[PDB]
Amino acid sequence: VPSTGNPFEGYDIYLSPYYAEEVEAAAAMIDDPVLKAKALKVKEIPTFIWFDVVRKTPDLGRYLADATAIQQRTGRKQLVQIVVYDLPDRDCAAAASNGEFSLADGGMEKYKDYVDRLASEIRKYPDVRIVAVIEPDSLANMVTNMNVAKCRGAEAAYKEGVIYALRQLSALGVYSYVDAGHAGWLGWNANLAPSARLFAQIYKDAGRSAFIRGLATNVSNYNALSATTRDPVTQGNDNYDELRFINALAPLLRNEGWDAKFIVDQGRSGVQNIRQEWGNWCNVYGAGFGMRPTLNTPSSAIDAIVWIKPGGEADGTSDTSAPRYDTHCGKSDSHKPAPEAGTWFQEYFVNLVKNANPPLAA
Numbered sequence: 001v002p003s004t005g006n007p008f009e010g011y012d013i014y015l016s017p018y019y020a021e022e023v024e025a026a027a028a029m030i031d032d033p034v035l036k037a038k039a040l041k042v043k044e045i046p047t048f049i050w051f052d053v054v055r056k057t058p059d060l061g062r063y064l065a066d067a068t069a070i071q072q073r074t075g076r077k078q079l080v081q082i083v084v085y086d087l088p089d090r091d092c093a094a095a096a097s098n099g100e101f102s103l104a105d106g107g108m109e110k111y112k113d114y115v116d117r118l119a120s121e122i123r124k125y126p127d128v129r130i131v132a133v134i135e136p137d138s139l140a141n142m143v144t145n146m147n148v149a150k151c152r153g154a155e156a157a158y159k160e161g162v163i164y165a166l167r168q169l170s171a172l173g174v175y176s177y178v179d180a181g182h183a184g185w186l187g188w189n190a191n192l193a194p195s196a197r198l199f200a201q202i203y204k205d206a207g208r209s210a211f212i213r214g215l216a217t218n219v220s221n222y223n224a225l226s227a228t229t230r231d232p233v234t235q236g237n238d239n240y241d242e243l244r245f246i247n248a249l250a251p252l253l254r255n256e257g258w259d260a261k262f263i264v265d266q267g268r269s270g271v272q273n274i275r276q277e278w279g280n281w282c283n284v285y286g287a288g289f290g291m292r293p294t295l296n297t298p299s300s301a302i303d304a305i306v307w308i309k310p311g312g313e314a315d316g317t318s319d320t321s322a323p324r325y326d327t328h329c330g331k332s333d334s335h336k337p338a339p340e341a342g343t344w345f346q347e348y349f350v351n352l353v354k355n356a357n358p359p360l361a362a
């Protein structure tokens, strides 16, 4: 049964061992001792643990086992931050993140199995709180990319999958935030009403459980939480940062029968005004680590600022011959050469460190 208030309150955030290991190896390739020590400070900043392949599901057990042992040893209640990201025909409007599951080859049933495997590890460790981000990009694409044939063909499956994950996770007391795009995707005034409709319907079909806490925004993106000085890339959009986006979405969601809360990714938001076009998302050059994870937010509607996308892990390959090459990853404002999405992109990480705002102290 669900407790009241902000679900992050009074919990220590478990630090990702996978990202810690990656940063450690990134730091070991950096010779400048002031940059090296700065790099190593990042494994101390909480990020979300992505389960983008079904071969990782058992690692959740290992993380929950580890977090439970920390809790027993310290007496400090722990919270593990995870991302559910493996819908069949994933990333239907792009090719950079492409997914192991196909709708043509038993995809929906395989996704159900993937969710059950996550659920079966979570059952093993009930004494630790979990916060989960559900399927980045999926529903966002249903609002704005129904024109794309692959997204149309995936719609039923996306909705069924997200609803299945929500009901299974909410049964086990996991706090969920469904991915809801960003200010430059759904904050456009035409997409605000249909977004509110869709997320409210998902909430309804998943059973209106209080463990379905709200939405996540700006995942794998670079938008400001709050900008005084406008970004000219946002020309035509009147909600040009994440707070305006949330302040315009929340009342509509309420009206559609869901008092949603929010969390906001700020992991690569340190530097604004680094894109020529607002739809440019792939390995954007010159980005920096942004506002640190905090429960001191500018709104009652926002539970937490977080780092969902772990900076340094690539968004997509720039190798034009690769099967998963997306032309957005070869843009002029993209850091090239880039390795496959998910894999370590060292020079990108280094710039994220160098461009950190607030700066990383050694």
Ligand SMILES: OC[C@H]1O[C@@H](O[C@H]2[C@H](O)[C@@H](O)[C@H](O[C@H]3[C@H](O)[C@@H](O)[C@H](O)O[C@@H]3CO)O[C@@H]2CO)[C@H](O)[C@@H](O)[C@@H]1O
Binding pocket: 091, 093, 094, 096, 097, 137, 144, 145, 181, 182, 184, 185, 186, 188, 191, 218, 219, 220, 221, 277, 278, 279, 280, 281
């Ligand atoms: O945020 C990371 C994900 O983004 C993806 O692309 C989306 C862009 O991020 C988003 O800015 C853009 O928004 C469009 C909108 O669809 C349209 O209604 C409006 O008029 O113009 C905007 C242009 O700024 O949409 C795209 C998706 O089509 C990637 O697909 C995804 O892989 C990535 O994780």
Ligand SMILES: OC[C@H]1O[C@@H](O[C@H]2[C@H](O)[C@@H](O)[C@H](O)O[C@@H]2CO)[C@H](O)[C@@H](O)[C@@H]1O
Binding pocket: 018, 049, 050, 052, 053, 096, 097, 098, 220, 309, 310, 313, 314, 315, 341, 342, 343
């Ligand atoms: O399996 C490789 C790698 O995936 C990482 O998740 C990626 C995902 O693969 C990518 O498509 C998406 O755009 O970004 C996320 C986060 O970088 C995951 O974090 C790694 O642990 C994993 O090894």
Ligand SMILES: OC[C@H]1O[C@@H](O)[C@H](O)[C@@H](O)[C@@H]1O
Binding pocket: 285, 332, 333, 334, 335, 336, 337
């Ligand atoms: O600003 C555009 C930048 O794109 C990147 O891919 C390159 O590494 C930079 O040298 C270049 O200037």
